[PDB]
């Protein structure tokens, strides 16, 4: 059973693919019910499956243009109002912005000298407490956040500009 994006969490401006694998940002807000689990301001969506224990892999195909960030979020990530996109808010992610790849550390993001990215493998380890990112062509390490996760952790996707996308690949 492979991951799919959870439409009930998705910001109403996001457009999810029919197969629930891909996400881009739309030009209008869909008329969707506001549900406590739905991100109402930040351009985020979670997968429908979260993890409380064990080790897990998934892969994310990434657009070549700016606008995306992806990784994992603690389930308690704030859904309502404009919120920071930071580890303190329970978001551990890579981001493409200004033509540069970043690990979204705080208060300053960390630039990654990894070269062009096409698909990224995410390795989540809830037994030791880490989430790691690898570029699939050679499995070169991109970044590892070491976190003592204290709750369920969900795959996280965010697209805040048109002209880029993220897609779960399995």
């Amino acid at each position: 059973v492979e991951l799919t994006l959870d439409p009930d969490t998705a910001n109403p401006r996001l457009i999810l693919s029919l197969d629930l694998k891909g996400v881009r940002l739309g030009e209008r807000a869909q008329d969707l019910p506001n549900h406590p689990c739905r991100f109402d301001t930040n351009t985020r969506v979670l997968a429908s499956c979260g993890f409380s224990s064990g080790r897990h892999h998934w892969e994310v195909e990434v657009g070549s243009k700016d606008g995306w960030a992806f990784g994992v979020a603690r389930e308690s990530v704030r859904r309502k109002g404009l919120t920071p996109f930071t580890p303190e808010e329970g978001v551990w992610a890579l981001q493409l912005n200004g033509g540069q790849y970043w690990a979204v550390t705080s208060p300053e993001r960390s630039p990654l000298s990894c070269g062009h990215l096409s698909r990224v493998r995410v390795a989540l380890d809830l037994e030791v407490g880490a989430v790691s990112f690898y570029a699939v062509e050679d499995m070169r390490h991109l970044y590892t956040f070491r976190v003592n996760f204290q709750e369920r952790v969900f795959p996280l996707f965010s697209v805040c500009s048109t002209g880029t996308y993220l897609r779960i690949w399995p």
Partner: peptide, 6 residues
């Protein structure tokens, strides 16, 4: 600026 909603 363009990423405030990320």
């Amino acid at each position: 600026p363009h990423t405030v909603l990320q």
